[PDB]
Amino acid sequence: NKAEKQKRDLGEELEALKTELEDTLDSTAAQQELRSKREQEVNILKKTLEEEAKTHEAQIQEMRQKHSQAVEELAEQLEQTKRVKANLEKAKQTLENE
Amino acid sequence: NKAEKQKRDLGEELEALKTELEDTLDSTAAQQELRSKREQEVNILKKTLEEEAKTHEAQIQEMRQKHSQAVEELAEQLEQTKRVKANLEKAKQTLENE
Amino acid sequence: AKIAQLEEQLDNETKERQAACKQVRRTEKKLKDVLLQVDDERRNAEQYK
Amino acid sequence: AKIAQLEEQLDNETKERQAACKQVRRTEKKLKDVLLQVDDERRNAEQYK
């Protein structure tokens, strides 16, 4: 899926480069605002990317705690079931001993 | 394999346009330095984002195996207790009859 | 006696299948290596075009 | 009972050995096509070169 999405990005970059080349005549005077605007947009993208990476770390922590809680709950049930099995086995020994 | 082949073919289109414009890149050294640095920064972001996504994705894969193995180990012991309960139930009916 | 001859045939037939599987996996690796050469050959023709 | 299980296992092993037989020819046929495909790509690069 990432390869298919990457193919669209490569094709879009080729079309953008072709249109940007023809706009070289107007880029000489438009760089005064595009430089400050493009730089600000890059900073906004970095903040969004950092937030996405931070959100993934928080989700991983929840999964580690959720998965660990499930294993911990199952472990407690094993101890209770194992302890109950000892009572059943001990009760059977009483019948055989009697 | 076909997707990777198409990616390499698409990349050749960008190199073809760059070679045809190399004659003008030298004359435009006043702004080519700043534009060239921006292109390298975009490539580093893709590699860092791809490496971060691949590294983060590996963490989820480990959880699907480490946590699953723990649940499978605990589940195996639980199933063993259920089978032992069936055998113990038959002993009670036989011991009570004797 | 039939079980003895049948068990021996199963082991011999099973061993033959394992040998064929090894040759299949071996030829697959060679095909993948030769398949990669197509990209290198096509890349040269593409770069020359 | 042992003859029934042994006969079923022996029959299944021989079928996977038509399975292994046809699989070997499939990989060999595909390998030959890859060898000729890379050869055609090599000639294409020479023509463009």
From Swiss-Prot, chains A, B:
| Post-translational modification (record) | ISGylated. Ubiquitination.
Judging by the UniProt lineage, the source's domain of life is Eukaryota
Write the protein's name.
Myosin-9
Composition bias, Basic and acidic residues:
1-10
Q: Which disease is it linked to?
A: Macrothrombocytopenia and granulocyte inclusions with or without nephritis or sensorineural hearing loss: An autosomal dominant disorder characterized by thrombocytopenia, giant platelets and Dohle body-like inclusions in peripheral blood leukocytes with variable ultrastructural appearance. Some affected individuals lack leukocyte inclusion bodies on classic staining of peripheral blood smears. Alport syndrome-like features of nephritis, hearing loss, and eye abnormalities are present in some patients.
What function does the entry list? Cellular myosin that appears to play a role in cytokinesis, cell shape, and specialized functions such as secretion and capping. Required for cortical actin clearance prior to oocyte exocytosis. Promotes cell motility in conjunction with S100A4. During cell spreading, plays an important role in cytoskeleton reorganization, focal contact formation (in the margins but not the central part of spreading cells), and lamellipodial retraction; this function is mechanically antagonized by MYH10.
- What does the entry state regarding organ or tissue expression? In the kidney, expressed in the glomeruli. Also expressed in leukocytes.
The free-text domain note is: The rodlike tail sequence is highly repetitive, showing cycles of a 28-residue repeat pattern composed of 4 heptapeptides, characteristic for alpha-helical coiled coils.
Oligomeric form and interacting partners: Myosin is a hexameric protein that consists of 2 heavy chain subunits (MHC), 2 alkali light chain subunits (MLC) and 2 regulatory light chain subunits (MLC-2). Interacts with RASIP1. Interacts with DDR1. Interacts with PDLIM2. Interacts with SVIL. Interacts with HTRA3. Interacts with Myo7a. Interacts with CFAP95. Interacts with LIMCH1; independently of the integration of MYH9 into the myosin complex. Interacts with RAB3A. Interacts with ZBED4. Interacts with S100A4; this interaction increases cell motility. (Microbial infection) Interacts with herpes simplex virus 1/HHV-1 envelope glycoprotein B.
Write out the similarity annotation: Belongs to the TRAFAC class myosin-kinesin ATPase superfamily. Myosin family.
Organism of derivation: Homo sapiens (Human)
* Portion of the full sequence shown: 1128 to 1225 of 1960
> Where is this chain's protein located in or outside the cell?
Cytoplasm, Cytoskeleton; Cytoplasm, Cell cortex; Cytoplasmic vesicle, Secretory vesicle, Cortical granule; Cell membrane
